[model samples]
Target: KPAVRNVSQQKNYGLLTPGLFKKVQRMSWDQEVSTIIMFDNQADKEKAVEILDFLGAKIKYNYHIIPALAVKIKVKDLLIIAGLMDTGNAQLSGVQFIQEDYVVKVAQVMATNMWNLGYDGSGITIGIIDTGIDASHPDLQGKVIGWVDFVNGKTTPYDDNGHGTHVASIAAGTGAASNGKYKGMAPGAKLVGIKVLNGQGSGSISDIINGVDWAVQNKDKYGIKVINLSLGSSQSSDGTDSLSQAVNNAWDAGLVVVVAAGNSGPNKYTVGSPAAASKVITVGAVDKYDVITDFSSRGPTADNRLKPEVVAPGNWIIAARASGTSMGQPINDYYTAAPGTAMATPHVAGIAALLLQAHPSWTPDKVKTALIETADIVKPDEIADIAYGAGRVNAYKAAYYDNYAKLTFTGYVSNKGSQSHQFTISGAGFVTATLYWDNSGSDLDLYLYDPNGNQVDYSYTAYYGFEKVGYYNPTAGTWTIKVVSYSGSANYQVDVVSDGSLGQP
Candidate 1:
């Protein structure tokens, strides 16, 4: 007989909550368990599925974005596969449970309520990957333009748990019930309901990965420019996690992805999977008073990269409620108030929609950079703290700040090598410079030198794959940028936005 492996000792073993694993272990050997297997290639994924099927494992879900498969297997077969998980050809990852996270004081706090700017995410569609959406809610009426139900195989989108409804309303609700008082950040934006979690506000990571792929596949079909993932896994990352791969894939596909930075805080390294993933805008929870919520997850991810790229008002937020779900207050009650990173996620999503509306041609990186750079520093001293991220997102500045300029270029660096570029600015009130890359796991550093030769590189020392530097009022002159490759070589983008004009590079 082959040696057996303990599921609890596996690298991704934590994917299954301790209680969940204990329950699984107690089950009879004849009983079955569902597990997601990730692969690095399509051929390997197909081969794994075939082998698992032959071993009496039922294939439940097939994914292409990250080339993964979900299967139901007997305990014996699961153990066999688990033993091979650490061999690198494939790995076993259980479905991590999703959690609810939340609403209208948030909009006012983010300056999104300043309606005269005409930035309500008009002509944009935000894909909500959560419990189904209540498309008919008065505040959300006419906003839901598309729907897909992963739970119960329902074709129409309906909120069984009310979580998705409240989230949607917080992002795009028209506030008809509040006489426009509780309007969402992007009231004019459309919605694409991608139901992954069930009515209980719970779902496995596989459901979400599949949901993300579906959204990407139908993105153009439904004009989805943004996706809001208010759900997260307790599982952390060392950069190769499956959900993280999916989030990056979506961003590379041009969808501005917004994720909740988990409510597992205020502890360090508590950021959940997918949110801990780089490149996507992972949002933390802040109150209307601009204080970081105790429950908002902080980071320096398992890999020690800074996370929760930004934050938003998420405490006691009021928004539209589902008709019969016990999750929130009923429609007759006017609105519901809830708190979590879940609530905070949609705020950034809505703000991204508004930013996309203003700059339709901007890439996901550009959208993320804009929100981070323009965020309000709630704690001036803790500007670089992982808890506050880049600070709470500010929509008014993001939507109407036309003084900024963005230039994108593709370049590479060899191991232990560096690259340099030069650009000039005519004037400067606040020159915000940022650098982002496609490979977050790669070790790359960004450096910005002012005309006077003052240098800035990961000023806070937490920027792993990305970096940002700000000059309150830089002198008008030539500025130099240097990118150092500490380990691997990959493609990168640098964005410099100033309160002044940018000269030719």
Candidate 2:
């Protein structure tokens, strides 16, 4: 079931020299390289993967162009040519490796949190808006659907640019290998591949924006509740840009938008577009030791606000398979030092899907809050602005926590179970807990049946400036609040004490 799609003629790729433009344009004769690459000179950068379109390959980024022609490998010889660039040039070499970022091999938020509850992101739909997907890849067979090519206007999403495929597999590829197969963060998650980039990972801002808009408009049509934006623009490092606003709108419309923090790192404030958007769950890359990836776009936003919402595994991370349109060299597809906020974004996206599947009623903002509030504060002493938003995504507590000991609130009068006990809940980093008192361990199907009903629906509102939230008072005392789980399982303290803001005694 592999399908083909075309590229769009319209859209601005960003400022580029005629020679660079010609190289990408001439490559039209070339195959298996639609995702073009872009170049940026700020903070010094190397040739990026997918060298045709600056938007897909290097928009707003500061990297020296890695001319597709310079690779020297014959187009046919390359198995798949992805955007491979240096974390940093010679000036800052030693500390620039992938391992410096603690995210390498860290179980993605979905996987780690699910492991605690023994559940994975299966039967959930996640939309990847990039170069499309490899519908025929043995590992990514039935999981991909609702395939659309915003670039070509079609139903199929095939990745001419290998970046999209690679990113997809990382999100949900079930490849076989040692240490078990290269399982994605959500191996069971269904994928909706939208081909927005070409063979060289090039596309216009309108294309990306339209792609996002399309996802937002039809998320329910394709069951796309979570979106993994493994791409970002190198320009506009703020939470309030037109493009950034588009993403925020998507977030407000009930879609989890996880964007790359960009690769313009080693700079004091280098976070780029999309990632800098305030409402988005911007992700930064970190190594195994919890150190931030230098190449990862850091920020205090141009407005001096925290940009990246959280951190995840990005450096030297490994997935089972690789998605390559070109086959010059046997794609190392597996464990490459593919360092970027690009890698970390998918991990969080997959996790959000899992969380959504587990809790279908949760709104997009609730999910985002879960990821951020439960995130581990890697550096407690350091006040992070846009450079490193909240912190790392913690999966353990994000899934399960010890917030309650089964305190039951007596019923009101006629209906005892109908009693709504409004009690004070004081927990550090508690996103919002669910009150489950179901005598039947499983959730009740109908709201009418079952006396000891489960907390099918709960309320989670407000996000104070602190790392945690506390409840003030108690209400009926007929219901017990079970600290379901922290947003990301990052918070260690759980306090359900009265906030002194109790109601109706």
Candidate 3:
């Protein structure tokens, strides 16, 4: 009889999620529910918290942004509140809603944790103008939503030369074969293989131009928002060639074109056709540690225009392998490793797909601007206009570049002088402090301190006018981000932004 009465004691159930309600119902006296209690008014908030205290509920925090209290209360105490509600108690009248306090997790995803924040290029498609892709490759199976072989005149995708398959994998391979160990930047994106190069990896310049035309004509048929050109031919390093004109036309026709600065470098004026196209985003290759690869091309186009707008991880990149192909050192039947600016081009292409998916209305120019502004400086000494463009492409920062720009600071400092800013945070926060200085004749470094006044982290390399430091597990309370102009004087800019796990500045 008592158990039956207990079951029917409550009048109206609280506005809790289904799972949270079940969890609370199953909780015992010793087990408490971590919850966020929102109040309808200040009076209600004050009275409800007092009632919570009388019931021995542990008040964890009070949020200034919302009229709420984070609390941990035993199920027994929770039942008492339910009983009070049944009697139309005034103490609980101000309560609006109570939700379970779910945990926040650090999703260690590739690139910039954009995948963790619900972006995976799901609605975007990239046109890959290369040799061909092996649609049967485990990592690329079914991702070939469209295909055409200008070389073999085939209806389905097939990578006879292997280069195209590897390139496509770097941008959109699902990584099913390796359990995502070798997944690409935008795994959820789709691919359209337009085979131009032949088995020997040679193609008529006209064939590539035809391939570009195909992508342009069919852009809407497959939702092809970006185009990846991983193969190029030697030119005068000018954007006037027929092939260059083809890529330029695609860009002007509203396709995001990504090209590769050829692998003939550490030298200037070697970036090849299509890549030398005036408006295309040209990519250079660097190793995992951000060191420019020996073969990664640099540029001052034969026309004197700076090329290779950005760089990315391209050396020895491992991705999906085509059957019967070993263009690169084979790791196994399912994967192979290769190096070249060809490999780097797909990264920028993949990031472009992600951006287009996130902002369906964003034009190529808008996407390009976000990438350039949010890129990390590769080196302070490297000529950004020619060597590394704006810097290395950062998919995470570019995805939310607006928020990052909201917290930027700019100023000038004297030789060996310092500038500092502070932000308040709780534990386990993610912070990335990026700095770049136009110390025309100077240098700067970045340093960080915890709430205890102890140095937690710093990046003070002997060279490079740019510096950055990231902290995954930050200390609680107000922490400091300091920048020091190490020599002469400097005009600098710093962007302090947090990952999704932390509150924005």
Instruction: State the lDDT of candidate 1 residue by residue for 1-505, as single tens digits.
Output: 1122222324334334343356567877688776666665777677666667777888777886777776667866665565533433343433232111111001232322435456788999999998888887888888888988887889876888889988898888888888887788888999999888876787777778888999999998889999999988645554446677888888999999999888888877787688788778889998878899899888867667778888988887777778776553333565777788888888889888988899988999878877887776567555545788777777877886675665554588877688877778866666665566677546666677888877843434344646555566667888877877766777887777776777755
Itemize residue pairs with steric clashes in candidate 1: 101-342, 101-343, 102-342, 102-343
Please provide TM-scores, in order, for all candidate models, with all chains considered together.
Answer: 0.78, 0.57, 0.61
Each model's total of backbone clashes: 4, 73, 1
Order of quality (lDDT): 1, 3, 2
lDDT of 1 at 436: 67
* Winner by lDDT between candidate 3 and candidate 2: 3
Best by TM-score: 1
Better structure of 1 and 2 per TM-score: 1
Relative to the true structure, how large is the alpha-carbon lDDT of every model? 0.73, 0.52, 0.72
Candidate 2, residue 293: how far the Cα is off, in Å: 0.8
Mind giving the per-residue lDDT tens digits that candidate 3 earns over 1-505? 0011121323325545344567877767678887766677556677777778787999865533245666788866665665533434433566665655543100111221124435668989998888799999988877899988877788978988889888999998878887877888888999999987888887755466667877887888999999998877544346754456667778888999999888878876677686788788888887777778888887756555557778887788888789999877777888888888888889889888888888889999778766766676656445244557656888887776655423567888898889887766664435656677764345577787878867766665433325565465576677788888766678888767664333324
Q: What is the lDDT of residue 277 in candidate 1?
A: 81
